[PDB]
Write an enzyme that holds these catalytic residues in place. Structure first.
Site, mmCIF file in Angstrom:
data_model
loop_
_atom_site.group_PDB
_atom_site.id
_atom_site.type_symbol
_atom_site.label_atom_id
_atom_site.label_comp_id
_atom_site.label_asym_id
_atom_site.label_seq_id
_atom_site.Cartn_x
_atom_site.Cartn_y
_atom_site.Cartn_z
ATOM 1 N N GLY A 93 0.812 -1.231 0.000
ATOM 2 C CA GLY A 93 0.000 0.000 0.000
ATOM 3 C C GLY A 93 0.837 1.268 0.000
ATOM 4 O O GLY A 93 2.075 1.177 0.110
ATOM 5 N N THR A 94 0.154 2.412 -0.121
ATOM 6 C CA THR A 94 0.693 3.798 -0.056
ATOM 7 C C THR A 94 1.439 4.015 1.268
ATOM 8 O O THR A 94 1.143 3.289 2.232
ATOM 9 C CB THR A 94 -0.453 4.803 -0.234
ATOM 10 O OG1 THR A 94 -0.556 5.090 -1.629
ATOM 11 C CG2 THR A 94 -0.269 6.086 0.545
ATOM 12 N N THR A 95 2.352 4.992 1.313
ATOM 13 C CA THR A 95 3.109 5.386 2.536
ATOM 14 C C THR A 95 2.328 6.470 3.295
ATOM 15 O O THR A 95 1.809 7.399 2.644
ATOM 16 C CB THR A 95 4.553 5.795 2.207
ATOM 17 O OG1 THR A 95 5.237 6.007 3.443
ATOM 18 C CG2 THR A 95 4.676 7.038 1.353
#
Ligand code: CL
Ligand code: MG
Lengths: 198, 233, 243, 242, 241, 244, 244, 250, 111
Positions: free
Chosen positions: G30-32
């Site tokens: 996933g995204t940070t």
């Protein structure tokens, strides 16, 4: 209320039941049969609350007829009365009890003896030589205490009912429009069609 | 590998994937193409209806949820019926209790949360349909893309179904043009018909084949089918 | 046939593999803890390891205050540790309300052990991969150490140790109690009982401790409390002026 | 094993697709919709000559304005007909009007996907999908004479003409060419009777095939064996003409 | 609690549990029913794996659902009881509400519905039972004979058989039963029933039981002798050629 | 999910058999043999105790012969624990019938009810069947002396003489050989012991390995009497019949 | 054998739960997203991958508020994160209803902790496919937490999860060393913007949108608010300057 | 959530074996040796206190448990399984008997109730059988002294004497030699201590041996006086001192 | 003891023409001897060319009208935007009212 009489003689049980059904100040019917055949040798007469009276009778009839087919056997009059008492004894402590009083007249083919059971809406069962429900008893029990013998023929038994009906027609306030009479013996259940003037 | 971790939705793969969810997403790509695009004043749905035989009807793709909101389906029609029926109730609840038209953004949030519950519990299956929700609420025109995964995204335009990439590239190029089609519904629909026609290949969009819906400033959500779409072919 | 290792049903050898593997999870943290009984106190020492510089050291704890009187140190993963902690706290509160006196250490121990036993017999519940060491100064039994495990086993101890290097700490304490001929640390002040526990922790593990390397809990008459970094430092300075 | 409501890697429900295979093994059922009425015809297909053919009930009345023919596991249909009959009469009780054919069909199809072992949605207590497809034919004042195909998938299509069962793909190709928008009711009767004769393993007579129609005037009627026998005689004469 | 889907579709569009339920019927003792002009007859064979039985008390193969309708079966004896009980209860429930005994068609349609429900209900297997339901509709002299199978499918037969070697005795009936002239007498109706069983039973005086049902709740089971007389007369038909 | 670990106890084999019922019958085939024999003037129940020790208290022991009613008893073959669950429910059904009709339950009605409970575990619930076969010895005023059998399938049948448990095939042949319709109880007691004596997997048939019960209508009364034999009484009848 | 990773609640021979560790892979994919604890509050920031020009800028909000004082941001399966915040909101409402005071951050942390941990106890549920960073201001100071799919959580000076967690953690570690006296809320917003821009380099192929929120005792009165307009641009410019 | 294990985990194998019961009996065999001997005027039950560490306090773990004041229980196999069975056994003695008849159940009936609980774990959905065999010794007015064994299957049998667990085969053999129908309770304790010495490897004293008797009424242990009919509990656990006294006359 | 019912007074009048219909009502809302509002509309356009007024207990009146308006909305959704005939509305309202037979809507309603 409605008249429910039962009389056990030598070899038969005779049930006499009033033909009148009344709501308010009107007699809606004058030929009502206040009895259901539970089995070929067991008959149940009934009286009480308007709806409960027939609903309960047909419910008991349904259960006995189901048992008869399942076992291919007829329950003894004693056995049927014990089943009915328990159903009323349950009913009395339910949300809305069945307000129904019953006489059960049956010929026990095993013992070769007629049997009459009186059960009220509480589930109060008792075996009697003669029985009545409601206000009928108040006049008929003293009559039968006097005139009843256990060795009486079916013919003597009908004469003894005729005497009970005559007394109820003389001293009871309401017109119950005569009675339907049914004999329970070793040969099953038949109706005396000629009690209008026997 | 994949064969052991795709038995149900309650199972993660060693790479951290939910195959039952991905398989549900596959049911969308097999579904007939539908396009959504909005200006500042109006939002338009253009859907290509699919037929079984030439003797059959072209199955309806657009469902009205309220007077200000509706959606186009791609995938299993029954799942679209379940989700649209749920969204109808949430729009209905908002009206009766709060005398408030349900915000399109909040409609998205509710669909997301309902889809998610089918992806974390045993016995359940993911929804096998993608939805494009349009609506005009208190914050202007809106277009949403719903995915069975639970992912809901607010967009200016998009397309889902078979060959949907054709329309999506066109809208990504036409963006600066159609965004400014304000107070002209006919030009926004024509721009949506030019979008869906970029995903054709089999046939050309006919009268009983094309399905268009519009919502906006002074336009309640209304569906145009047949004769009524003849002036856009 | 081969699913007798996935759920808590018997293997042909009469073994529950899920219970045995749950025991294995208890060492995942690589933390060693010991408990010793004083004259009128009970002390628990646990290793405190903070690898990440971004972590808030104050929030990292495997020692829990269950009630006013009972303290519990856990050996195992923190999610399962906190599951067991909240349940023990709930059971300690409920007991007091229903029976009108503070739940004894050994009764909470038995209760938590009985819960663990149910996960050992029912398929849909997995065992918690933790070992719970309960400590108090019980108002009937005095200084008390009672320990439960994923099998649903529990027993009282004179002293105990848990974790990877459990056996080394155990035999160290054993040898002290063979020598002293008593079943407790003959000391009036709890401070010196804590100093004893840290001293024998160092001797057995063969490692020196700074103030942030340890985590201490003390049970006395009518209270259980954990020491701050500075309370431990004062304790580390005392043992230093003897060696 | 594997869930009953499991998706295939191609994005299809296994149990639904296997259900469609059961329907292909079923007796042939044909529907033709005209501006004079909708005709429904079925293959009886008695498994033995001792089987009293007229006891085979594969065309049933839902209401006076809606009938339906079935194909596949016909036992599964009983509870679907019961729900349909209840839905139609219940709607008449609530709104004092005939239910729309499309709305009745939509109600039957709502059952189709209510299968699982406890699927997170409502309470779908049914172990498997239905093993039967329904041709629901009716009339209403809004959309006139209508023929619908109700699958165990929960999707329903409106057809001008449709064939389901063993001889479906063959019969459907025949209906493709023969159907026009200006067919009479009589033309549609012979046409169903002709296409049944083509796909039936047995020689079509008035005992192993049953006709029925739904007209605005007389409603849904099942054709008695004497009436069907004359339409068979009429067919043979017109086929032998050229 | 238990709702595991046992009856499910297989890739080829078959419900194996319903399919294997029919195999339990094939295993069961042969049952046959032929309907005459003014009667229906139900014949059933008795097993001979163990012979030392009390024939007075051992449950007989033909059961009365009401005074005018009877039900014979082939398959799991235990399963048949649960269907017979539910039928007998429904028979009384119908009389109580409609004020009329069930039709043979209605009683069949009910029993068929029960069998069907167990093919798509969670945590249950289908009934390993096929039934022959026979009798006369109330105040009707037209004889009735129906068959049900585990799937829940039902239909009426001029004559039908189910169970082990049903394939053989059906073949016999197909080329021995004329629909133009059905067995006009009670006697010649029973004769055709015993004849059809003797194809499978292989000399069984005590291995064949017959039940005759006539209009207006007239049901009687024939004794060993009465059946043994039919067997004696049929074996003379063969030897006189 | 949980589907992975489900045995599916209530499914058909491709042949149309119930796996668990068939395997439960296989379990019972290893249990101590139990025999019932019906005579003109009573019924006999005899059962062989499976596994015994010198230190097994036989006086306070009952593992095969249980009393359901004052007029009905059962011989058990299989899991004792499973049998006690069914026996307890059967005892209750008998008392429910008596409370309802003020008449002792006819033997078949009790047997059918127990058989219907067994059938339930066969068709639904996803539980293992009861690893139990019963011989019912009872008397009622309709059919007189009756002998029934029931097995995990929930199927029941009536018998003049029958065996369940171990070596039923051998036991049934010996009974079918020496049984006559005009038999007396004392003849049936002898037949029962003779049959067990020849089907036993042990050295000799001693008293300490037997349970015995008779249901007789003692002529000097006119009522039915159940007699569950005491150790000393089994030891006596064992010497009289000529097995010592 | 094997198959220890096919069911949720199953322990592997090395005392691990593979289904939980597989959920971590969904998070890492996933995204940070980050969290920075300043001297009197907390700052939350997240990377928003712009799939196409069709995404309406500033509309698809990811950071969620619990009550009025707690901020929540997550990496991995966004629906799973929403489901956890939905529970968190029910959990915070329940607390406030009974105890009047808004839920303390540690109290709220354990509430999410116990719920996530519960989804590792049974095979009938799937573990959460998100690592959640959350916190805010309560009675006694600011608190920052990070919650793993295992149910594991700790207090943090700085936290990071998702694609570029290493880049983030490295930049956070530098701040903790170079500011022992503590970072200010104003500074932490600028600093958060930089760390997202630096951590984006692990996904530099796709253009991204920056989203920041903060809960400061002095700057937002201890209420969770979104960074908007001038202060957002000032933070974007600070990052765009120090990326070169 | 929700127990979706509504199906039996114990099923008949094609051989007719119930696997989980057989495997449970295997777990019992691995357990420490425990025995019971019935005398004319009492019963004795004994086991070895296998301390899991010398730091552990063996006193805080009772392998021998009072169920009623006249009934005691000892086991071989899994300790936790035993502990919850004792809890359920004590409660069922009250709920199913004492709260109805106003007296404690007789040994055979309480045994019958424990047997039922263990049978249900053999058939009920989503459970394994109990991995213990119990030895229940008790007294009641109408049966006198009795000793019962209860197995994971739910089966129970009355014994004059027996042993279960590790060295049961050897221990049963030694009891067959030494047992007679004329043993006094003191003779049975002596035989019990002899039999258990063959099972124990290490230290054999009052601190490593747990032994209780069902004997005469202990009015000193009742805790109150003034009710003549109440004479006290027949169950007594022997002290560490009382065992060592009898070990010097070994 | 709490009384769930009240009386908000007012009167309504419906007359049917050959090709038209009128539903009239006063705009006064009262409690006991106090005036609540001089203008509180009571007759409502419910769509599909149907006008409705439930006069009596205002709370039960508003509740019924609100449920019928909602009933019309769901008739459109479930029957392809079909117009609800006045006879069909009447039968639908019978079911709305009889639904609360044992806790009735204290209103006399005219459409
Ligand atoms: Cl407990
Ligand atoms: Mg009375």
């Amino acid at each position: 209320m409605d008249i429910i009489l039962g009389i056990r003689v030598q070899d038969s049980v005779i049930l006499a039941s009033s033909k009148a059904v009344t709501r308010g100040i009107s007699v809606l019917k004058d030929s009502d049969d206040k009895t259901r055949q539970l089995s070929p040798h067991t008959l149940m007469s009934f009286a009480g609350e308007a709806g409960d009276t027939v609903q309960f009778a047909e419910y008991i009839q349904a259960n006995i007829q189901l048992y008869s087919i399942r076992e291919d056997y007829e329950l003894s009059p004693q056995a049927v009365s014990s089943f009915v008492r328990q159903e009323l004894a349950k009913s009395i402590r339910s949300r809305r009890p069945y307000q129904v009083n019953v006489l059960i007249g049956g010929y026990d083919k095993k013992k070769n003896k007629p049997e009459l059971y009186q059960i009220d809406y509480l589930g109060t069962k008792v075996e009697l030589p003669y029985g009545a429900h409601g206000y009928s008893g108040f006049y008929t029990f003293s009559l039968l205490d006097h005139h009843y013998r256990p060795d009486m023929t079916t013919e003597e038994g009908l004469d003894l009912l005729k005497l009970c009906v005559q007394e109820l027609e003389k001293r009871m306030p309401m017109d119950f429009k005569g009675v339907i009479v049914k004999i329970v013996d070793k040969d099953g259940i038949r109706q005396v069609d000629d009690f209008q003037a026997q | 590998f994949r064969n052991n971790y795709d038995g149900d939705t309650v199972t993660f793969s060693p790479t951290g994937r939910l195959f039952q969810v991905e398989y549900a997403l596959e049911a969308i790509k097999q579904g007939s193409v539908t396009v959504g695009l909005r200006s500042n004043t109006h939002a338009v749905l253009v859907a290509l209806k699919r037929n079984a035989d030439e003797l059959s009807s072209y199955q309806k793709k657009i469902i009205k949820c309220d007077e200000h909101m509706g959606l186009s389906l791609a995938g299993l029609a029954p799942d679209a019926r379940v989700l649209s029926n749920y969204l109808r109730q949430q729009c209905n609840y908002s009206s009766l209790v709060f005398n408030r038209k349900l915000a399109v953004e909040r409609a998205g949030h509710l669909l997301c949360d309902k889809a998610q519950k089918n992806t974390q519990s045993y016995g359940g299956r993911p929804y096998g349909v993608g939805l494009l929700i349009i609506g005009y609420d208190k914050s202007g025109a809106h277009l949403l893309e719903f995915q069975p995964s639970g992912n809901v995204t607010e967009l200016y335009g998009t397309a889902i179904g078979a060959r949907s990439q054709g329309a999506k590239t066109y809208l990504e190029r036409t963006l600066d043009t159609f965004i400014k089609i304000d107070g002209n519904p006919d030009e926004l629909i024509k721009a949506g018909v030019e979008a869906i026609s970029q995903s054709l290949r089999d046939e050309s969009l006919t009268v009983d084949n094309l399905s268009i819906a519009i919502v906006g400033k002074d336009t309640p959500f209304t569906i145009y089918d047949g004769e009524a779409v003849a002036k856009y072919i | 046939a081969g699913y007798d290792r996935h759920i808590t049903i018997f293997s042909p050898e009469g073994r529950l593999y899920q219970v045995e593997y749950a025991f294995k999870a208890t060492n995942q943290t690589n933390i060693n803890s010991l408990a010793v009984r004083g004259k009128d106190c009970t002390v628990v020492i646990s290793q405190k390891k903070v690898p990440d510089k971004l972590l808030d050291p104050t929030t990292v704890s495997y020692i829990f205050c269950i009630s006013r009187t009972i303290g519990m140190v856990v050996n195992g993963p923190i999610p399962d540790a906190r599951n067991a902690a909240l349940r023990a706290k709930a059971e300690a509160a409920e007991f007091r309300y229903k029976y009108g006196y503070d739940m004894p250490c050994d009764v909470l121990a038995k209760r938590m052990a009985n819960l663990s036993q149910i996960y050992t017999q029912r398929a849909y519940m997995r065992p918690l991969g933790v070992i719970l060491t309960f400590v108090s100064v019980d108002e009937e039994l005095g200084p008390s150490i009672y320990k439960t495990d994923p099998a649903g086993y529990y027993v009282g101890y004179k002293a105990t140790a848990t974790g990877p290097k459990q056996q080394e700490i155990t035999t160290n304490l054993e040898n002290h109690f063979k020598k002293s001929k008593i079943d407790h640390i003959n000391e009036e002040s709890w401070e010196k009982v804590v100093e004893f526990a840290i001293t024998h922790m160092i001797d057995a593990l063969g490692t020196e401790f700074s103030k942030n390397d340890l985590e201490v809990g003390v049970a006395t008459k009518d209270k259980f409390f954990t020491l701050s970094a500075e309370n431990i430092e004062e304790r580390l300075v005392a043992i230093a002026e003897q060696d | 094993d594997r869930g009953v409501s499991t998706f295939s890697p191609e994005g299809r429900l296994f149990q639904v697709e296997y259900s469609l295979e059961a329907i292909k093994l079923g007796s042939t059922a044909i529907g033709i919709a005209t501006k004079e009425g909708v005709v429904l015809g079925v293959e009886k297909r008695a498994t033995s000559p001792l089987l009293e053919s007229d006891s085979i009930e594969k065309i049933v009345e839902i209401d006076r304005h809606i009938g339906c023919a079935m194909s596949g596991l016909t036992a599964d249909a009983r509870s679907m007909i019961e729900h349909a009959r209840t839905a139609a009469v219940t709607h008449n009780l609530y709104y004092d009007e005939d239910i729309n054919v499309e709305s009745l069909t939509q109600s039957v199809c709502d059952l189709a996907l209510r299968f699982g072992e406890g699927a997170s949605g409502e309470e779908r207590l049914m172990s498997r999908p239905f093993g039967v497809a329904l041709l629901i034919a009716g009339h209403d004042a809004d959309d006139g004479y209508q023929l619908f195909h109700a699958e165990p998938s929960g999707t329903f299509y409106r057809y001008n003409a449709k064939a389901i069962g063993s001889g479906s793909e063959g019969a459907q190709a025949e209906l493709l060419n023969e159907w026009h928008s200006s067919l009479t009711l009589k033309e549609a009767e012979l046409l169903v009777l002709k296409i049944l004769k083509q796909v039936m393993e047995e020689k079509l007579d008035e005992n192993n095939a049953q006709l029925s129609c739904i007209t605005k005037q007389d409603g849904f009627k099942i054709y008695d064996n004497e009436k069907t026998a004359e339409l068979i005689k009429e067919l043979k004469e017109k086929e032998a003409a050229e | 609690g238990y709702d595991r889907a046992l009856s499910i579709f297989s890739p080829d569009g078959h419900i194996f549990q319903v399919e294997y339920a029919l195999e339990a019927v094939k295993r069961g003792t042969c049952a046959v029913g032929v309907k005459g002009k003014n009667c229906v007859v139900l014949g059933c064979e008795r097993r001979s794996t163990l012979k030392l039985q009390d024939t007075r008390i051992t449950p007989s193969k033909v059961s009365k659902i009401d005074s005018h309708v009877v039900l014979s079966f082939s398959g799991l004896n235990a399963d048949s009881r649960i269907l017979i009980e539910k039928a007998r209860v429904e028979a009384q429930s119908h009389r109580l509400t409609l004020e009329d005994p069930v039709t043979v068609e209605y009683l069949t349609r009910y029993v068929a519905g029960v069998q069907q429900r167990y093919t798509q209900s969670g945590g249950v297997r289908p009934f390993g039972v096929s039934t022959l339901i026979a009798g006369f509709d109330p105040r009707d002299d037209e004889p009735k004979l129906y068959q049900t199978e585990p799937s829940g499918i039902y239909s009426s037969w001029s004559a039908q058989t189910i169970g082990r070697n049903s394939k053989t005795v059906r073949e016999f009936l197909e080329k021995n039963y004329d629909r133009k002239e059905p067995p006009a007498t009670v006697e010649e109706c029973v004769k055709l029933t015993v004849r059809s069983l003797l194809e499978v039973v292989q000399t069984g005086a005590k291995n064949i039981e017959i039940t005759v049902v006539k209009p207006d709740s007239d049901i009687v089971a024939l004794s060993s002798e009465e059946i043994n007389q039919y067997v004696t007369q049929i074996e003379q038909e063969k030897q006189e050629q | 999910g949980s589907r992975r670990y489900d045995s599916r106890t209530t499914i058909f084999s491709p042949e149309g058999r119930l796996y668990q019922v068939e395997y439960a019958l296989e379990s019972i085939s290893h249990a101590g043999t139990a025999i019932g024999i019906m005579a003109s003037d009573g019924i006999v129940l005899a059962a062989e105790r499976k596994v015994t020790s010198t230190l097994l208290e036989q006086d306070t022991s009952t593992e095969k012969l249980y009393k359901l009613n004052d007029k009905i008893a059962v011989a058990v073959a299989g899991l004792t624990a499973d049998a006690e669950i069914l026996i307890n429910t059967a005892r209750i059904h008998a008392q429910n019938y008596l409370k309802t009709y003020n008449e002792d339950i006819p033997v078949e009605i009790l047997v059918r009810r127990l058989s219907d409970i067994k059938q339930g575990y066969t068709q639904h619930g996803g539980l293992r069947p009861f690893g139990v076969s019963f011989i019912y010895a009872g008397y009622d005023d309709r059919y007189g002396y009756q002998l029934y059998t029931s097995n995990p399938s929930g199927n029941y049948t009536g018998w003049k003489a029958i065996s369940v448990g171990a070596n039923t095939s051998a036991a049934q042949t010996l009974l079918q050989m020496d049984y006559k319709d005009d038999m007396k109880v004392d003849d049936a007691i002898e037949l029962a012991l003779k049959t067990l004596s020849k089907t036993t997997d042990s050295s000799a048939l001693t008293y300490d390995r037997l349970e015995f019960a008779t249901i007789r209508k003692g002529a000097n009364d006119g009522e039915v009497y159940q007699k569950i034999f005491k150790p000393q009484e089994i030891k006596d009848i064992l010497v009289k019949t000529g097995i010592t | 054998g094997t198959g220890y990773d096919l069911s949720n609640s199953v322990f592997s021979p090395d005392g691990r739960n593979f289904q939980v560790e597989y959920a971590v892979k969904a998070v890492e994919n996933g995204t940070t997203s980050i969290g920075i604890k300043c001297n009197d509050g907390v700052v939350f920031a997240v990377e928003k991958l712009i799939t196409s020009k069709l995404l309406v800028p500033q509309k698809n909000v990811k950071i969620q508020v619990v009550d009025r004082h707690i901020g929540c941001v997550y990496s991995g399966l966004i629906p799973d994160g929403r489901h956890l915040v939905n529970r968190g909101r029910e959990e915070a409402a329940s607390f406030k209803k009974l105890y009047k005071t808004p839920i303390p951050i540690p109290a709220f942390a354990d509430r999410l902790g116990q719920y996530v941990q519960a989804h590792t106890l049974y095979n009938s549920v799937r573990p959460f496919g998100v690592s959640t960073i959350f916190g805010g201001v309560d009675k006694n100071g600011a608190h920052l937490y990070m919650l793993e799919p295992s149910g594991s959580y700790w207090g943090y000076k700085g936290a990071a999860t998702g694609k570029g967690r290493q880049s983030a953690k490295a930049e956070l570690e530098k701040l903790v060393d170079h500011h022992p006296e503590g970072l200010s809320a104003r500074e932490a917003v600028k600093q958060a913007a930089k760390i997202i821009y630096l951590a984006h380099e692990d996904n530099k192929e796709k253009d991204f949108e920056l989203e920041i929120s903060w809960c400061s005792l002095s700057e937002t009165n201890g209420l969770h608010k979104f960074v908007k307009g001038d202060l957002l641009q000032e933070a974007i410019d600070f990052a765009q300057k120090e990326i070169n | 959530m929700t127990d979706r294990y509504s199906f039996s985990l114990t099923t008949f194998s094609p051989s007719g074996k119930l696997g989980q019961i057989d495997y449970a009996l295997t777990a019992v065999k691995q357990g420490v040796t425990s025995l019971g001997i019935k005398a004319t005027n009492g019963v004795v039950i004994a086991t070895e206190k296998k301390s899991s560490s010398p730091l552990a306090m063996s006193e805080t773990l009772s392998k021998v448990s009072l169920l009623t004041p006249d009934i005691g229980a000892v086991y071989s196999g899994m300790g936790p399984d035993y502990r919850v069975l004792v809890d359920k056994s004590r409660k069922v003695a009250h709920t199913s008997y004492k709260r109805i008849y106003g007296e404690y159940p007789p040994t055979k009936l309480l045994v019958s109730e424990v047997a039922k609980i263990m049978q249900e774990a053999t058939q009920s959905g989503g459970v394994r059988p109990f991995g213990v065999s119990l030895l229940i010794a008790g007294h009641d007015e109408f049966n006198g002294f009795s000793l019962y064994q209860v197995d994971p299957s739910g089966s129970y049998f009355p014994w004059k004497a027996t042993a279960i667990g590790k060295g049961s085969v050897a221990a049963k053999t030694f009891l067959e030699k030494r047992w007679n129908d004329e043993l006094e309770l003191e003779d049975a304790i002596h035989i019990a201590l002899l039999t258990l010495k063959e099972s124990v490897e290490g230290e054999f004293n009052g601190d490593t041996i747990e032994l209780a008797i069902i004997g005469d009424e202990n009015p000193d242990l009742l805790g109150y006086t003034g009710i003549p009919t109440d004479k006290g509990p027949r169950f007594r656990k022997l002290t560490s001192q009382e065992i060592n006294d009898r070990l010097e006359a070994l | 003891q709490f009384n769930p019912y009240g009386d908000n007074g007012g009167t309504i009048l419906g007359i049917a023409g050959e090709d038209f219909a009128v539903l009239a009502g006063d705009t006064r809302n009262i409690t006991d001897y106090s005036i609540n509002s001089r203008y509180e509309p009571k007759v409502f356009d419910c769509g599909d060319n149907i006008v409705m007024s439930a006069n009596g207990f205002a709370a039960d009146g508003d509740a019924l009208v609100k449920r019928f308006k909602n009933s019309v909305k769901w008739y459109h959704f479930d029957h392809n935007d079909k117009k609800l005939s006045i006879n069909s509305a009447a039968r639908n309202i019978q079911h709305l009212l009889y639904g609360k037979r044992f806790f009735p809507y204290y209103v006399h309603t005219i459409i």
